[PDB]
Amino acid sequence: GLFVTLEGPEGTNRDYLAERLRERGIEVQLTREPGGTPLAERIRELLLAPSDEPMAADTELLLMFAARAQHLAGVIRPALARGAVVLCDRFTDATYAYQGGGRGLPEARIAALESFVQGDLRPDLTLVFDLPVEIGLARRLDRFEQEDRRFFEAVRQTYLQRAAQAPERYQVLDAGLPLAEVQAGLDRLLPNLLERL
Ligand SMILES: Cc1cn([C@H]2C[C@H](O)[C@@H](CF)O2)c(=O)[nH]c1=O
Ligand SMILES: [Mg+2]
Ligand SMILES: [Mg+2]
Numbered sequence: 001g002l003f004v005t006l007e008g009p010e011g012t013n014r015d016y017l018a019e020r021l022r023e024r025g026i027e028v029q030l031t032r033e034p035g036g037t038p039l040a041e042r043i044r045e046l047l048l049a050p051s052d053e054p055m056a057a058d059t060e061l062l063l064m065f066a067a068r069a070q071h072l073a074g075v076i077r078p079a080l081a082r083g084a085v086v087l088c089d090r091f092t093d094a095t096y097a098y099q100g101g102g103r104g105l106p107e108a109r110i111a112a113l114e115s116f117v118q119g120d121l122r123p124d125l126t127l128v129f130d131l132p133v134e135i136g137l138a139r140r141l142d143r144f145e146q147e148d149r150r151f152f153e154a155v156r157q158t159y160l161q162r163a164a165q166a167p168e169r170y171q172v173l174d175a176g177l178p179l180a181e182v183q184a185g186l187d188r189l190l191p192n193l194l195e196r197l
Helices: 013-023 038-048 057-081 092-102 107-118 133-138 149-165 179-196
Strands: 002-007 028-032 085-089 125-130 170-174
Touching: 002 057, 002 092, 002 179, 013 028, 013 085, 013 179, 028 057, 038 057, 057 085, 057 092, 057 107, 092 107, 092 149, 125 149, 125 179, 133 149, 149 170, 170 179
Parallel strands: 002 085, 002 125, 028 085, 125 170
Antiparallel strands: none
């Protein structure tokens, strides 16, 4: 199967992409992180709540990876195994962007967890939906949404940087464009997928 993740700055396209695949006789598994199983979604809710006790940064990183571990076991690996295209909303790039760029944790700490949790499993293709920080935010606020501008700017820039450095694994789309244009960019990227598959 094929492991596709969708990323971008904080703030529809996925449904269009899935139906293009389904039309073409492909099984599609839609999912999201942190999340995607009952336990993982319990971890989600602890991560996103604007709780009176500030969550330590290492706690936040560990919980993102603990939800990822569960989801990989229960959802992602099984789907890949039966030949599904997984379209996962956010994955370890978001960890690099949010926890590394935004929060300031060392890229090295994230890399060591990525390897521990995932083995050699990486996304086959990562779609980065790029747009200006304040547009994204416009699209109640969770703990990450309540963040300051530099945090979001560092998120945006981390995604562009990671894509620049491994261009074969990433496509960056302009997500600020009108919807019809964004869908056309999705249609333009399908031949490559039918082919990685
Ligand atoms: C998958 C993932 C998501 N996030 C953030 C981005 C959203 O604000 C929120 C829910 F997806 O969690 C994050 O900070 N790190 C991650 O690894
Ligand atoms: Mg959000
Ligand atoms: Mg802040």
